[PDB]
Amino acid sequence: GVLFINETDIGWMPYMNSWLERSQINILKQQKEMANMPEYPVIDDVAKSVFYRCFQSYFEQNIDVHDKNRVRHICPMVDIAMIQTICTILDALLIQHLPKLKQMKEEDEKQALEAFFIFAGLWAIGGPVGGGQDDSKDMKEFNTV
């Protein structure tokens, strides 16, 4: 008896929302033998909003980002695989720069958390960009999107 899940039905948004709220992560650390989990950073009320506002604005909205001809990957990256790499890099950026962010003011804190995404995304998507004949052009095609 076959139950076929479609990719759009479940999606990648549930992971992005569950990672922002720290819902899935929190439960696994508590209720497992995995005691060697690297403690995740605190996504403050502003810091959550700024990623939710951004994640949704550089994936749902951007058609260029998912255009195969613009973004020429090496391996055939699944959408969730890219969202996971954004999330792990955002984790590692926050933990490094958390006490500097909380000392900064509303405007310069927001513009960092925005930049921290753009950089996290840059590697998540642009990192696996490459292959073909001219790697240099598939880089300069992504470099413009």
Structure notes:
The PDB classes it as structural protein. The entry lists the keywords outer-arm dynein, axonemal dynein, microtubule doublet, structural protein. Structure of outer-arm dyneins bound to microtubule with microtubule binding state 1(MTBS-1). The protein is Outer arm dynein beta heavy chain. This protein is mainly α. The chain has 7 helices and no strands. It is globular and about 45 Å long.
Largest sheet: none
Strand percentage lies at under 5%
Query: Which value, in Å, is the CA radius of gyration?
Result: 17 Å
Fraction of residues in H or I helices: 55-70%
Query: Oligomeric form of this entry?
Result: part of a larger assembly
E-strand count: 0
Q: What is the end-to-end distance?
A: 44 Å
* Secondary structure tally, helices: 7
Overall, the morphology is globular
Structural class of the secondary elements? mainly alpha
> Could you give the order of the helices and strands?
HHHHHHH
PDB class: structural protein
Keywords: outer-arm dynein, axonemal dynein, microtubule doublet, structural protein
Entry title: Structure of outer-arm dyneins bound to microtubule with microtubule binding state 1(MTBS-1)
Name: Outer arm dynein beta heavy chain
